[PDB]
Design a protein around this ligand. Structure first.
Ligand SMILES: CCCCCCCCCCCCCCCC(=O)O
Lengths: 22, 88
């Protein structure tokens, strides 16, 4: 249920690219 | 597993066609205790049914997640039913 709540608030469907500074 | 709610005694003559025969009868009324079943047969089924509703709060496009959740909930219910049939 915790994961479900976390996912409910996720905006972008792509993870961190690994080559950026946020 | 039971609890004897009440016990009763009755004496009567069975009027069988040739003649009447005496009879005594000692009855018990057992009531089954459910804490086993509530804690073990109903709780996991209720929890799995609740978990199956998590798919509605996931986006439609997330096909893998929703499908995995739904079908694994179905598999878990199947496992519970089959093993409970075996044990009971
Ligand atoms: C009956 C419970 C079903 C399972 C839980 C589903 C809800 C998981 C997602 C969390 C939603 C709660 C936060 C809502 C935020 C808001 O008000 O917009």
């Amino acid at each position: 249920i915790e994961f479900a709540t976390v996912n409910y608030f996720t905006k972008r469907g792509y993870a961190w690219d690994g080559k950026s500074v946020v | 597993q039971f609890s004897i709610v009440e016990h009763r005694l009755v004496s009567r003559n069975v009027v069988f066609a040739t003649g009447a025969y005496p009879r005594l009868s000692l009855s018990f009324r057992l009531k089954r205790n459910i804490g086993y079943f509530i804690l073990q047969t109903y709780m996991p089924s209720i929890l799995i049914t609740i978990l199956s509703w998590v798919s509605f709060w996931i986006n439609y496009d997330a096909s893998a997640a929703r499908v995995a959740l739904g079908i694994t909930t179905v598999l878990t219910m199947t496992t519970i039913n089959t093993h409970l049939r075996e044990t009971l």
